[PDB]
């Protein structure tokens, strides 16, 4: 189904080595971070006022990464 | 004591408002991003490689802040 969000999130994969390459190519992402805690992370910030929308779904993003493993969750602060 | 880190990490406190200001004084930090999940909270990552150190301890950024309850707490990731 079509996947949106206005706010920032992560990355969990067990094959990130095309997370960058891909998000490069949305124009609603604003800059991609792999976390020093956990090398299946990977947090994406979007650009302000955007919001990332991907019309064929995590399938797709699963697809464009080659990773089937991917997943899309929340950013989690330590205080919530 | 002196502060130091290699790694990113969080700004914790109730007075946000000069943070990102104060931030951008350090050349071994790259950015700065207010959580979207808590207006308390900032990220900082850091350029590669550099290393953030703090003379004055985290004191000193709480006396550069103007914030007593500026706190540095690392990332949390999802497990």
Redesign the interface.
């Known amino acids: 189904a079509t996947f949106q969000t ?3 999130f ?1 990355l ?1 994969g067990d094959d990130t080595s095309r997370y960058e390459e891909v998000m490069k190519t949305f124009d609603t992402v604003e ?1 991609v ?1 792999k ?4 090398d299946r ?1 990977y ?1 994406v ?1 979007l650009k302000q006022g955007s919001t990332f929308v991907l019309n064929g779904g995590i399938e797709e993003l699963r697809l464009l990464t080659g990773d089937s493993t991917l997943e899309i ?8």
């Open positions: 206005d706010a920032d992560l969990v800059a971070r976390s020093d805690l956990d992370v947090m910030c969750q929340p950013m989690i602060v330590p205080t919530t």
